[PDB]
Design a binder for this molecule. Structure first.
Ligand SMILES: [Cl-]
Ligand SMILES: [Cl-]
Ligand SMILES: [Cl-]
Ligand SMILES: [Cl-]
Lengths: 107, 107, 107, 107
């Protein structure tokens, strides 16, 4: 239930051989602020989590240690999953179609 | 590259028939602050993103619209993936083993 | 690179306390055939993998130990990901829209 | 509930501008057999699904249109998720530790 951002950031720092001032430089904050991230005394805003997730190639969920725990109709989930087979050109067309219809006929 | 939290929160509000004050009550903030979330004028901290993701049953990545874009050795990835087959009782034992060894013999 | 279905099925059998004849009954095959699955001498067809994945609540990828290893434009991936926020009723409408247009105007 | 491998393979063939004989060459089967895959008259074995998923960069689940639908204790799931933060060198060590202990002291 409780996230573990401070523990995770501490382990990333260790495993990557980083110093707090290097992370501070990455996020444009004080080195002191990064110390407080690590100790859990203070937490970053969404923009800072995104910069860290991008740097370390992590999902935001992995970075903060967030985990969860139902579709009524599975053939819809199956259709949605099937969009991952489409080329980017075909997905681009579907996005225009759906955006257009939503603009013209707002639910 | 740019997240779309404000757009996503706005669509969740619409599709769920929520009023800003209901979301405000959920997060223990002012209704005005929720208005600013929706317009993108201000962003929530990690604790507020987690409360929203939990409420709407979403990953934090889905909630904010974060997307990314390599293992050197795939048999390790394959091993890690294989842990998802294990019972919770067996994963609990592995966690104790690994935590213990890390405590005794800190890399 | 090489899948590990036989190793995985063997570990599932062990961790669940199953006997080969119980798995055979699940798949409507001979107990001997299940023995050959476990030893890697023979592999199941897609229908049998789906029955096993469903029984054990696993992805087919997890069940067989399959792992992989690029979007040209990430805002499309981000849009696709955003569909996971939509209600089933709204996804159902999008599916009809897209299916209809594909039927009328086949790429 | 019902997979959609034949529909998916048909759409991949279309979107990629492939001919059946090209897919046949990829899988080392007759062109006729690929025709039967597409019409759903016959299904490939796991080795052939893996070759297709690898070629098209898809999960096996995406390729066949398989979808599913609980952890008792979430802090274990959270620990397992946290392994994705580790370097490959550290995961390699954990794998040796766990494999060794399993070999010495078989549950
Ligand atoms: Cl600062
Ligand atoms: Cl407030
Ligand atoms: Cl049989
Ligand atoms: Cl053949």
């Amino acid at each position: 239930i409780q996230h573990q951002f401070a523990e995770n950031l501490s382990r990333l720092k260790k495993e990557h051989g980083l110093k707090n001032h290097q992370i501070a430089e990455l996020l444009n904050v004080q080195t002191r602020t990064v110390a407080y991230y690590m100790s859990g005394e203070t937490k970053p805003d969404i923009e800072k989590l995104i910069r860290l997730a991008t740097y370390f190639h992590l999902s935001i969920d992995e970075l903060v240690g967030y985990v969860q725990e139902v579709w009524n109709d599975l053939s819809l989930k199956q259709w949605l999953l099937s969009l991952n087979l489409r080329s980017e050109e075909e997905i681009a067309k579907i996005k225009i179609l759906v955006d257009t219809v939503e603009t013209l006929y707002p639910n």
